[PDB]
Amino acid sequence: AGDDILLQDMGFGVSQRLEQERLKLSRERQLAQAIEEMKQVRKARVLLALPKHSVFVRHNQEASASVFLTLSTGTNLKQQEVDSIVDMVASAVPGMKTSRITVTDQHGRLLSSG
Amino acid sequence: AGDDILLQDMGFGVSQRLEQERLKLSRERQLAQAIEEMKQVRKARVLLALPKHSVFVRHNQEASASVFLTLSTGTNLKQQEVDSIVDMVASAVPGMKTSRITVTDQHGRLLSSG
Amino acid sequence: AGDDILLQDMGFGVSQRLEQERLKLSRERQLAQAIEEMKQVRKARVLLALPKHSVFVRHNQEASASVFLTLSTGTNLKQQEVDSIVDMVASAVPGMKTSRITVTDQHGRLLSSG
Amino acid sequence: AGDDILLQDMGFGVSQRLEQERLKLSRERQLAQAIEEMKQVRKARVLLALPKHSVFVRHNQEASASVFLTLSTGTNLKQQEVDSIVDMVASAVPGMKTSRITVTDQHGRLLSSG
Amino acid sequence: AGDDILLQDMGFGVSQRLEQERLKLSRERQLAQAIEEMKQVRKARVLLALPKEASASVFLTLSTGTNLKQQEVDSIVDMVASAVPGMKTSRITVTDQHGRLLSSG
Amino acid sequence: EDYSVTLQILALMTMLGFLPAMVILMTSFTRIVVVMSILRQAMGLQQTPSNQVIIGIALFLTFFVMSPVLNEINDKAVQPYLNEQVTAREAFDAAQAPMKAFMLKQTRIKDLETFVTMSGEQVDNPEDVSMAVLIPAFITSELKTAFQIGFMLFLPFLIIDLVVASVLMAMGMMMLSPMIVSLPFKLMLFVLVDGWNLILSTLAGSFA
Amino acid sequence: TFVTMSGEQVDNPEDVSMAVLIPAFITSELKTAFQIGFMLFLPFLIIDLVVASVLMAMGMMMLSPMIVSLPFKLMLFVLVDGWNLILSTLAGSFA
Amino acid sequence: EDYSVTLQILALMTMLGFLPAMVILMTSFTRIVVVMSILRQAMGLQQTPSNQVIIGIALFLTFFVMSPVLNEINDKAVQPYLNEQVTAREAFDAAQAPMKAFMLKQTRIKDLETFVTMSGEQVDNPEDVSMAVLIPAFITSELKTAFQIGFMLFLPFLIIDLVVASVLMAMGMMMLSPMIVSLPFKLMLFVLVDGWNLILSTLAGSFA
Amino acid sequence: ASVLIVGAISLMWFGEALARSLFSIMSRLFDLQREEIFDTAKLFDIALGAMTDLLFPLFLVLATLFTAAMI
Amino acid sequence: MTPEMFVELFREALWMVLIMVCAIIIPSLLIGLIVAIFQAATSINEQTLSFLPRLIVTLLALMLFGHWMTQMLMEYFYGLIERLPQVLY
Amino acid sequence: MTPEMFVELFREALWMVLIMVCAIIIPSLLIGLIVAIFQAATSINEQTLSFLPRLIVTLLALMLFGHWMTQMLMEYFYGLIERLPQVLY
Amino acid sequence: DFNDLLTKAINNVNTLQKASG
Amino acid sequence: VTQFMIQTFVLLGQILGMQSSLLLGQLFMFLTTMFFLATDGHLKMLQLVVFSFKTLPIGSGSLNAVDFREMAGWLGIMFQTALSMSLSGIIALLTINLSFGVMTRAAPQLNIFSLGFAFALMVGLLLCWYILAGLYSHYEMFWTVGEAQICRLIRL
């Protein structure tokens, strides 16, 4: 139930900035919905950062993402699990090389650099 | 069941970018359908990333995908099965050579790098 | 029965992109209908990917397809069967030489890569 | 009974694209109807793949065809029969040199390569 | 719950600059909401400085006791730095309710 | 065996002879000139900015946007040539390479496709095409791009013109010409939006 | 026309003199050019007529259709890819 | 070190060839003509003042407003050069500086920033920026300034035309074109206020 | 017939004041200083000021046309 | 070219504008007629009243048929291009 | 650009011009009806008295919505500039 | 750079004229 | 200065033509050229330039800033002189058109449109016949103003 935003008619007069923001929001929603199906995680919150690219100016910024995972009462993610998480989040969004994903949890331990 | 969007009619509210999104969504849905009929897969969810493939003579962005699977109650997918999944997804969507697919499972074991 | 789309009248306001998508969908429907006439095949789903055909190689996109099938309760496709399927799909659609057709099954054994 | 489409009057809302698709559909229907006139053939459907063509272009597609038919309860087509089928199919439609026809049957035996 | 800014529909009265500020405010609210889910932190307030170089300033009210080690503040600052476009991880100020600094700028 | 000094001078003097052709075909001059032309006709002013000023502005703009490629020619083809490090034939190739690369960044693959077929040469990669084929493809792409930008700038002035005509028709004064009243508002919008600085900045940033 | 004007005895066109072919060739090219030009003129003329009548329907008989029509004339030449379509036809007109 | 007599003559003839450019790109000619273009367009006359007298009045107006800078060039550069007090190289620089100072007095900071970044050069003081970059910024400011003045000049004529149209419509005669009636009123109010003298004061004095 | 006559009668006295109104607007919008030209906000303020100062005399004349029209 | 071919081209151009112009004006024509009947029903005659409904409806008609007009024009331009080799010979 | 991009751009301007004109002509239209019913009550057939109330209210609408309309068009001019790289991409 | 190219060319001509004179 | 005078008459021709619901500048331009030739205007200009050699020597002397401003102020001279010549006619053009409008305003069925175009142009041509009847006196006063300006330039 992430794609509800896309299937709405988005009214009219919405500025380009607002449309990009709402599209990114939908992307975050569906990514979080997918991550919820992980057995280990209970709650997920996904934030995206996609710059303007704009080959007409040479100051590119490159993309990034940050996924917070409130996990189960016990249990911890192994290296394979966090690597799968970062691979999925990276390949779902255009650009965003997989080395710019931050993965955290409620315990406050950092899982992937930035 | 995915074709509901295509056979639907957009009102004059929509605008370019939004249209694109809905088209992609349709593919996702039907692609999800293609995975569902597998005995092993119980639920599927597809996320795509298709850049513009710009006109002029600049280099493009090498579209990507990420498909999440909730398998049967038990079972572990074989290498043949994941190979079939990635081949179907890669050949279903223009461009996006088979080396841009991340396949994960409910238990969290990564099945294809990105 | 796939020909419903073609014989219909598109309402005023269908974006050109939507028309191309509906033509692709119509071709998919008639291909699926042709495949459903196969004795071994009970359900068929077809997805396509259209080309660009630029004389430059680095920008050429080339066509492709991906067809899923749920076969009968028993029996498995022979080499002749899959060859017939791929040849029919290939020659039905412009471009898309026989080397880029992905055929899978309900059990998920790969029958043709891309 | 295929000629109904041609003799009809297309109202507004159909485009060049839809008109071309409907012309192709008319040719396919009349070719299938003429094929059904052979005793060995019981049910048939033909698909065509014709490029945009137009003079003053750099076409690199070339034509293609694919005729599918389910025959009588028994009987097997000889090479002579399939040769007659392919020759009439190729000569009916402009272009499509006779080496680009895929003929299948009800049971999946391939009768002409592409 | 911060996204309510995005899903709300702006009247014609708003004009660009206000819209950009509202987008940033939505980002701040959702970042704070994400941070709250940590066990140690009870309240968080996030501020951003994004040019039209970007930077962040995150204040945390922790529990009654406990203090954030270098690892926890590293996770916090990296999450904020990666979530917002630009803002390399060397330009974030992190403080606490007792005023002890956790990240210089 | 580089070209003799007498032939080298004869070649350079010929290039100066075709200097107007190089500027009007191989550079950014055409797109800027056309966009300025559309903008001038978009407003009520026929030739108020005058033709010499429009070309004068374009000449400075086309020199600034092509300073990187001009420097690349100097740093790779002129200085090695003057320092006696490259054959004159090599230096000519070293000067032509950045110019070809710049024209390819601002061209459309459809333009290359039609001209390559028109020339009838079997070339696949879109980087080793002849200047005889690249130049018509480049100038065709610049004209089409200028029309797109010209239409973009024309729309706000069309909006003002329709509003003024509609308001006048609302009061029943159909005899009053909308153009005379529309013009000060067209000047008004273009000046409080800082149009002149905006358009020249966008035209400069367009070539990328 | 020029063979009768030059007063020479010509049996077949493929052996006429050069002095009688150059005036005839340029004459045919000018006529053929006009026919192609008329083809391209119609789509822009239709847009001008359409926008002129729409403005007249709403009662504004003082607004010049030329200003309003110009953005649409440019767009028609753009999304049809005119600068590639026209040149390809002109090159293809000699084959 | 100093240029020879033969080379100095060549430079002198070169600047005479570019003399029309220096008038319309460096002096105040562009602003005056654009403003006078608006004045002709604002009134119902289309070509009635004719192009010849507008340029001739603009030329005389420029010589009036450029007289301080031209005299400053005469004193600082021409006089030492004629008396052989200074060399030709420094005399040319001494003549260039007053032109640069005048162009700085008629430009805006935003315009300079756009072009100095566009040129991709390094500078910290506006006073020592190259004249090649100052020229596009100068005319861009001039065009914006001229549109501002022209917009203010267009308002009173729009005011008169709207009043006449409203009066005719209010009297019930929805059949008479406002332009014919309004034209004498616009011309009468342009004369009894001595409009051109007021425009001279706000145009010649606008530079300072 | 009566409406046009009263308008001409109104133009006898109100028209002279309307001529004064047009005189002031042209005089102010022509006499600009360096500070006024270089500021966009100041130009719009005078544009509104010239607009509003026009409305009051124009409204009186048109009201004189309306009042006689009903009578 | 043959005169009959010229008339063909002339007719299809006039048919193109007629179809395009009627699809845009017919909505305005009906609305203007509806307002006029309503004004007659209440015994008022205001010439400038029936302008807002016509302008809005016409703008709505232009927005609704934006894709249809573009498709019609683009295909017509292609049709003349493809009809050119038939004429030149 | 693409045919759909033109329709998007065309509709946005058409929506913009519709909003720009509607804010001014709506008050004049309502006042016209108010004068119309007044002349229906007194049975006076004069048709020139209604010009003044429409003209006064029209200027009132311009004064009230002058800043909002100018800002909307100015932001629209910026909006096309912002989307210009997207079209040229 | 490219700007100095014209300056160097004129100086060489001036030097050649100066030495010749 | 000579171009200023002739084009002012061209201004006089076009204002009458514009007010005449309507090339009429050329009619005035040609006639004003005849006035320039008939009044020996060319001889006077040649006498002025040779006098300029006496009172404004070649060596020391040039136009000052005040001369430029006086010459730049001739645009106001054009409009004031052109309006002065046409004020009587332009009032006549307006009053007959306003009289025609009010007299035919009783029936809104007639209107004017093109019917008003024909009526306006016939009267406008007739008024131009009146303008040419008394144009010579205006030219004589205009030439005196222009000649005085020329002598001011040469400091005579």
The last residues before gaps in chain M (C-N over 2.5 Å) are 22
User: Are the CB atoms for H62 and H106 separated by under 8 Å?
Assistant: no
Largest Cα–Cα distance in chain I? Answer: 52
Do at least 3 CB pairs under 8 Å connect A with I?
no
Contact across the interface for A7 and B22, Cβ inside 8 Å: yes
- What's the rounded Cα separation, in Å, for the pair D51 and I70? 75
Classify residue D55 as left (phi > 0), alpha (psi -120 to 50) or beta: beta
User: Are the CB atoms for H132 and L6 separated by under 8 Å?
Assistant: no
What six digits make up the tokens of F201?
Answer: 């900045």
Contact across the interface for M112 and H57, Cβ inside 8 Å: no
> Which residue in K43, K54, K59 has the most chain I C-beta atoms within 10 A of its own C-beta, making it the best mutation to test that interface?
K59
How many other β-carbons are positioned within 10 Å of the β-carbon of residue G2? 17
Listed residue (C111, H159, D60, A79) closest to I47, CA to CA: H159
- What's the rounded Cα separation, in Å, for the pair H190 and H197? 10
| The pairing of beta strand A41-49 with beta strand A64-71 | antiparallel
Q: What is the residue type of M94?
A: L
Neighbours of K, requiring at least 3 CB pairs below 8 Å, are A, B, C, E, F, G, H, I, J
- What's the rounded Cα separation, in Å, for the pair M120 and M21? 6
- What's the rounded Cα separation, in Å, for the pair K59 and F159? 20
Resolution (A): 3.2
∠ CA A60-F198-I49 to the nearest 5 degrees?
140
User: Are the CB atoms for I61 and I6 separated by under 8 Å?
Assistant: no
Classify residue C13 as left (phi > 0), alpha (psi -120 to 50) or beta: left
What six digits make up the tokens of J85?
Answer: 């080799």
Which residues of chain E does K75 touch, with a Cβ-Cβ cutoff of 8 Å?
A: 15-16
What six digits make up the tokens of C100?
Answer: 């880029």
Which single residue is written with the structure tokens 């480049």?
Answer: F138
Helix, strand or coil for residue H27?
Answer: coil
Which of the 8 DSSP states describes residue J10? H
- What's the rounded Cα separation, in Å, for the pair H158 and F188? 13
User: Are the CB atoms for F36 and F60 separated by under 8 Å?
Assistant: no
Which of 2-41 (I) contact K at CB < 8 A?
A: 3
Which of 39-78 (C) contact B at CB < 8 A?
A: 43, 45, 47, 49-50, 59, 61, 64-66, 68, 70
Please list the residues that pair with D44 across neighbouring strands: D69
User: Are the CB atoms for B108 and A41 separated by under 8 Å?
Assistant: no
| The pairing of beta strand E92-96 with beta strand E55-62 | parallel
Length of chain J: 89
What six digits make up the tokens of M22?
Answer: 């309507």
DSSP conformation letters of C55-87: SSTTT----EEEEEEEE-SS----HHHHHHHHH
CA-based nearest residue in chain J for residue B10: J64
User: Are the CB atoms for K18 and F163 separated by under 8 Å?
Assistant: no
Residues near F203 by Cβ (< 8 Å), separated by ≥ 6? F31, F32, F35, F61, F149
Contact across the interface for K73 and F159, Cβ inside 8 Å: yes
Minimal Cα–Cα distance from J58 to chain D, Å?
Answer: 20
What six digits make up the tokens of M103?
Answer: 């007299």
Please list the residues that pair with B102 across neighbouring strands: B66
CA dihedral for E19, E20, E24, E30, sign (positive or negative) = positive
CA dihedral for F128, F133, F136, F140, sign (positive or negative) = negative
Instruction: Give Cα separations from G53 to A103, B28, F163, G68, H87 (angstroms).
Output: 63, 46, 18, 12, 71
Which single residue is written with the structure tokens 């501020």?
Answer: E47
Phi, psi of F190 (to 5 degrees): -70, -20
- CB proximity F201 to K under 8 Å: no
> Which residue in C9, C10, C12, C22 has the most chain J C-beta atoms within 10 A of its own C-beta, making it the best mutation to test that interface?
C12
Length of chain K: 89
Which residues of chain B does K5 touch, with a Cβ-Cβ cutoff of 8 Å?
A: 16
What six digits make up the tokens of D31?
Answer: 């070719």
Q: Is C23 exposed, middle or buried (0-12, 13-18, 19+ CB in 10 A)?
A: middle
Contact across the interface for D70 and C37, Cβ inside 8 Å: yes
- What's the rounded Cα separation, in Å, for the pair M56 and M154? 6
CA dihedral for G64, G66, G71, G73, sign (positive or negative) = positive
Residues near M33 by Cβ (< 8 Å), separated by ≥ 6? M6
> Which residue in M75, M100, M102 has the most chain I C-beta atoms within 10 A of its own C-beta, making it the best mutation to test that interface?
M102
Q: What is the residue type of G43?
A: P
| The pairing of beta strand D64-71 with beta strand D101-104 | parallel
- What's the rounded Cα separation, in Å, for the pair A62 and H100? 42
How many other β-carbons are positioned within 10 Å of the β-carbon of residue H192? 13
- What's the rounded Cα separation, in Å, for the pair I71 and I64? 11
Please list the residues that pair with C46 across neighbouring strands: C67
Contact across the interface for K29 and J52, Cβ inside 8 Å: yes
∠ CA M42-M48-M53 to the nearest 5 degrees?
135
Which single residue is written with the structure tokens 């005189």?
Answer: I23
Edge-to-edge, what's the strand order for the sheet holding D41-49? Answer: D41-49, D64-71, D101-104
User: Are the CB atoms for M156 and M50 separated by under 8 Å?
Assistant: no
- What's the rounded Cα separation, in Å, for the pair H63 and H71? 11
| The pairing of beta strand C101-103 with beta strand C64-71 | parallel
Listed residue (A54, A53, A6, A43) closest to A27, CA to CA: A6
User: Are the CB atoms for H168 and M63 separated by under 8 Å?
Assistant: no
> What element of type H or E holds C102?
strand C101-103
Which of 39-58 (F) contact H at CB < 8 A?
A: 44-45, 48-50, 52-53, 56-57
Which single residue is written with the structure tokens 């100041």?
Answer: I42
> How far does CA L10 lie from the centroid of its chain?
3
Please compute, for residue K82, the number of CA atoms within 13 A of its CA located in the half-sphere on the CB side.
Answer: 12
Where b means 16+ CB within 10 Å and e means fewer, G28-62 reads eeeeeeeebeebbebbbebbbbbbbbbbebbbbeb
- What's the rounded Cα separation, in Å, for the pair J1 and B1? 54
CA-based nearest residue in chain B for residue J63: B12
Contact across the interface for C68 and B23, Cβ inside 8 Å: no
User: Are the CB atoms for E32 and E55 separated by under 8 Å?
Assistant: no
Listed residue (I15, I46, K58, I56) closest to H153, CA to CA: I46
Which of 19-78 (H) contact K at CB < 8 A?
A: none
Residues near E55 by Cβ (< 8 Å), separated by ≥ 6? E48, E49, E87, E91, E92, E93, E105
**Segments in chain K forming alpha helices (H):** 3-42, 51-88
| Helices and strands, number each (H, E), in chain B | 3, 3
Largest Cα–Cα distance in chain K? Answer: 65
How many other β-carbons are positioned within 10 Å of the β-carbon of residue D49? 21
- What's the rounded Cα separation, in Å, for the pair C22 and C10? 10
DSSP conformation letters of chain F: -PPPHHHHHHHHHHHHHTHHHHHHHHSSHHHHHHHHHHHHHHSS-SSSS-HHHHHHHHHHHHHHHTHHHHHHHIIIIIHHHHTT-S-HHHHHHHHHHHHHHHHHHT--HHHHHHHHHHHT----STTS--HHHHHHHHHHHHHHHHHHHHHHHHHHHHHHHHHHHHHHHHTT-TTS-HHHHHHHHHHHHHHHTTHHHHHHHHHHHH--
Where b means 16+ CB within 10 Å and e means fewer, I13-43 reads ebbeebbebbeebbebbbebeeebbbebeeb
Contact across the interface for K85 and A15, Cβ inside 8 Å: no
User: Are the CB atoms for C45 and B28 separated by under 8 Å?
Assistant: no
User: Are the CB atoms for D113 and C87 separated by under 8 Å?
Assistant: yes
Question: How close are the terminal C-alpha atoms of chain E, in Å?
Answer: 30
What six digits make up the tokens of I71?
Answer: 């009578």
Listed residue (H202, H184, H208) closest to H38, CA to CA: H202
Torsion angle in degrees (nearest 10) through CA of D65, D68, D69, D75: 90
Helix, strand or coil for residue A66?
Answer: strand
Classify residue B41 as left (phi > 0), alpha (psi -120 to 50) or beta: beta
Contact across the interface for A114 and E82, Cβ inside 8 Å: yes
User: Are the CB atoms for J65 and C12 separated by under 8 Å?
Assistant: yes
Of K46, K49, K56, the CB nearest to I59: K56
- CB proximity C113 to B under 8 Å: yes
